[PDB]
């Protein structure tokens, strides 16, 4: 009977609906503090980049909760956050399963593919724009010089150690880091053919050395990534011609 509603026993249920709405917010701030690489050293860089877009969503929550005075009653605030109530319930339990790194990057692209939502689509589009920033950074250094950059990442590392005595393919063993399943996922082109050819043009760039839709913007990055691999492939055809 403590307060419960000046209107009899109504706040006893309405305040639980917004405390449960308040319950999901302290999970997102709990998740953001535990994955930072100043308090942990076992999470991936793509796992860190998903949080970097999440923390920009946290200050939008903080700027909106600071503007709710002066409140009239408990309906005027919960109905303002009724649209925001659907969003926070989505935005917390997508990661809570436990996907990590490229699989977490695979969970978020599917969730950005789930339109018929029009306020949940651009925030996950923005999370796809931020979480793909370390992965796309590892793309252009690999196709223009061939340097592998991450010391600790979700993407598996191969050494590509070449014997000096045998010239076999300048590498003498590579295998694959995704050895047989080859499941490069969820980035532009969908990483089903061009992932096999950013492989081989990445093999040959260092052979030069030492002698409205989430799919449409995906398709806009796709053909430039088809254009530059064919541009690096037409250099190694000329390098085979001259040597």
């Amino acid at each position: 009977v403590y307060i419960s509603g000046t209107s009899p026993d109504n706040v006893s249920s309405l305040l639980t609906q917004v405390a449960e709405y308040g319950t999901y917010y302290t999970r997102l701030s709990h998740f953001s503090l535990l994955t930072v690489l100043d308090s942990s050293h076992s999470n991936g860089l793509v796992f860190q980049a998903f949080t970097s877009g999440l923390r920009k969503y946290l200050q939008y929550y903080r700027a909106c909760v600071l503007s709710t005075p002066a409140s009239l009653t408990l309906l005027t605030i919960s109905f303002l956050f009724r649209k925001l109530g659907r969003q926070l319930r989505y935005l917390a339990e997508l990661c809570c399963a436990f996907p990590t790194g490229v699989k977490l990057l695979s969970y978020l692209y599917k969730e950005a593919l789930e339109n018929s939502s029009n306020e949940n689509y651009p925030v996950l589009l923005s999370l796809l724009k931020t979480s793909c920033e370390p992965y796309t950074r590892f793309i252009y250094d690999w196709v223009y010089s061939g340097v592998f950059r991450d010391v600790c990442g979700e993407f598996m590392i191969q050494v590509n150690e070449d014997y000096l005595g045998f010239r076999d393919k300048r590498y003498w063993t590579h295998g694959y880091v995704l050895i047989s399943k080859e499941v490069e996922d969820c980035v532009p082109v969908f990483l089903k053919h061009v992932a096999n050819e950013i492989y081989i043009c990445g093999k040959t760039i260092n052979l030069l050395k030492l002698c409205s839709l989430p799919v449409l913007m995906k398709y806009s990055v796709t053909a430039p990534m088809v254009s530059h691999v064919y541009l690096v492939n037409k250099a190694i055809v000329d390098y085979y011609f001259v040597e």
């Binding site: 409205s212 541009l231 250099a235």
Partner: peptide, 29 residues
């Protein structure tokens, strides 16, 4: 040899203008 490589980097310069046009289309959306 160098004349064939001059047209290859010229196509990369056209791709760089296409990447700036795609960034302007992302700013308009």
């Amino acid at each position: 040899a160098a004349a064939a490589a001059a047209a290859a980097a010229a196509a990369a310069a056209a791709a760089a203008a296409a990447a700036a046009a795609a960034a302007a289309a992302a700013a308009a959306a």
